[PDB]
Design an enzyme around this catalytic site. Structure first.
Site, short mmCIF file in Angstrom:
data_model
loop_
_atom_site.label_atom_id
_atom_site.label_comp_id
_atom_site.label_asym_id
_atom_site.label_seq_id
_atom_site.Cartn_x
_atom_site.Cartn_y
_atom_site.Cartn_z
N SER A 47 0.80 -1.22 0.00
CA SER A 47 0.00 0.00 0.00
C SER A 47 0.84 1.28 0.00
O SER A 47 0.27 2.36 -0.18
CB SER A 47 -0.95 0.00 1.20
OG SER A 47 -1.89 -1.06 1.09
N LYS A 50 0.31 3.39 -3.04
CA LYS A 50 -0.82 4.29 -3.19
C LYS A 50 -0.35 5.73 -3.39
O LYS A 50 -1.11 6.58 -3.86
CB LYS A 50 -1.74 4.19 -1.97
CG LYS A 50 -2.58 2.91 -1.97
CD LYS A 50 -3.50 2.80 -0.78
CE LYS A 50 -4.38 1.56 -0.87
NZ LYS A 50 -3.60 0.29 -0.73
N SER A 95 -6.17 2.87 3.61
CA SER A 95 -5.52 1.94 2.68
C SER A 95 -6.56 1.09 1.95
O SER A 95 -6.55 -0.14 2.00
CB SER A 95 -4.52 1.05 3.42
OG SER A 95 -3.51 1.81 4.05
N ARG A 227 5.30 -0.48 13.33
CA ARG A 227 5.83 0.32 12.23
C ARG A 227 6.01 1.77 12.64
O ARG A 227 7.08 2.36 12.46
CB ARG A 227 4.91 0.21 11.01
CG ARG A 227 4.77 -1.20 10.46
CD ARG A 227 3.68 -1.25 9.40
NE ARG A 227 2.37 -0.97 9.98
CZ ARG A 227 1.24 -0.93 9.27
NH1 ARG A 227 1.26 -1.13 7.96
NH2 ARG A 227 0.08 -0.67 9.88
O1 LIG Z 1 -1.60 -0.87 7.07
C1 LIG Z 1 -1.58 -0.89 5.82
O2 LIG Z 1 -0.81 -0.19 5.11
C2 LIG Z 1 -2.53 -1.82 5.11
C3 LIG Z 1 -2.61 -1.82 3.72
C4 LIG Z 1 -3.44 -2.72 3.07
C5 LIG Z 1 -4.18 -3.64 3.80
C6 LIG Z 1 -4.09 -3.68 5.19
C7 LIG Z 1 -4.71 -4.78 5.97
C8 LIG Z 1 -5.05 -5.99 5.36
C9 LIG Z 1 -5.38 -7.08 6.10
C10 LIG Z 1 -5.42 -7.03 7.51
C11 LIG Z 1 -5.68 -8.17 8.31
C12 LIG Z 1 -5.66 -8.08 9.68
C13 LIG Z 1 -5.40 -6.87 10.30
C14 LIG Z 1 -5.15 -5.75 9.56
C15 LIG Z 1 -5.13 -5.80 8.14
C16 LIG Z 1 -4.80 -4.69 7.35
C17 LIG Z 1 -3.29 -2.73 5.84
#
Ligand SMILES: O=C(O)c1cccc(-c2ccc3ccccc3c2)c1
Ligand SMILES: [Cl-]
Length: 242
Positions: A47, A50, A95, A227
């Protein structure tokens, strides 16, 4: 010119993790990292893509402005914040992959490839599906390559309009107070090993700008908050933020 500071490794080990933080002092044109090898190892952007995706969509008119509403397609997904209408600001904040997948389809492989080369972005390789190549395709980027790209964005030097770059920098706004402004984007890469999290952006001070790019191992989603936390501990250690 680059210096390696292995003392930052303490911030990763305290949390039973592994990763890299890269800092760049814009005034002094000097870089700092805990791990020069990993600083230059290329990962899926996930992401964090983006940022370039927004720039291209805006500059081609795929996105009119930061107010245009992208209506939920009615398909229920496991991320609750995705099952709603979004604009560029909220799509970035949460995101919202499905919104950006539609951007990519409308951008098209040809124009996307051309634009990424003009951006000198990573390995500039969009091999894979046009609507997921940044998740499981061939594109790769290192932490140091993130900084070079971000520095151009900050200075409006990318090969898109000033307007496009200003809008994306607005949408990158993450945190602001009396001491600093952070514009950044998170990333979470799971489809290809090793699973990692990203956080890339910069810290605006009164008299300087500190660019930063970090990635860390993310075997489970439970550590995603590290992070920002790990990055901020380094910033605090280097006295960049109180
Ligand atoms: O933090 C991001 O940059 C982000 C970018 C794209 C997707 C996700 C995402 C996807 C699946 C998840 C599953 C469990 C908990 C959190 C989750 C978060 C986070
Ligand atoms: Cl702003």
């Amino acid at each position: 010119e680059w210096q390696e500071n292995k003392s930052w490794n303490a911030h990763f080990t305290e949390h039973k993790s592994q990763g890299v933080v890269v800092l760049w002092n814009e005034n002094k044109q000097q870089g700092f990292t805990n791990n020069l090898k990993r600083a230059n190892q290329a990962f899926l952007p996930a992401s964090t893509f983006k940022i370039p995706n927004s720039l291209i969509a805006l500059d081609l008119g795929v996105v009119k402005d930061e107010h245009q509403v992208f209506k939920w397609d009615g398909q229920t997904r496991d991320i609750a914040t995705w099952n709603r209408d979004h604009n560029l600001i909220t799509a970035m904040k949460y995101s919202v992959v499905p919104v950006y997948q539609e951007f990519a389809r409308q951008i098209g492989e040809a124009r996307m490839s051309k634009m990424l080369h003009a951006f000198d972005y990573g390995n500039e390789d969009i091999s894979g599906n046009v609507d997921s190549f940044w998740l499981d395709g061939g594109i790769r980027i290192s932490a140091t390559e993130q900084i070079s790209f971000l520095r151009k964005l900050y200075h409006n030097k990318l090969h898109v309009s000033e307007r496009s770059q200003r809008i994306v920098k607005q949408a990158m706004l993450t945190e602001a107070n009396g001491d600093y402004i952070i514009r950044a984007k998170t990333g979470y890469s799971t489809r290809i090993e090793p699973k990692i999290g990203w956080w890339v952006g910069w810290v605006e001070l009164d008299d300087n700008v500190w660019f930063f790019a970090m990635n860390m191992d993310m075997p489970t989603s439970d550590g995603l908050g590290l992070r920002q936390a790990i990055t901020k501990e380094v910033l605090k250690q280097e006295k960049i933020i109180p």
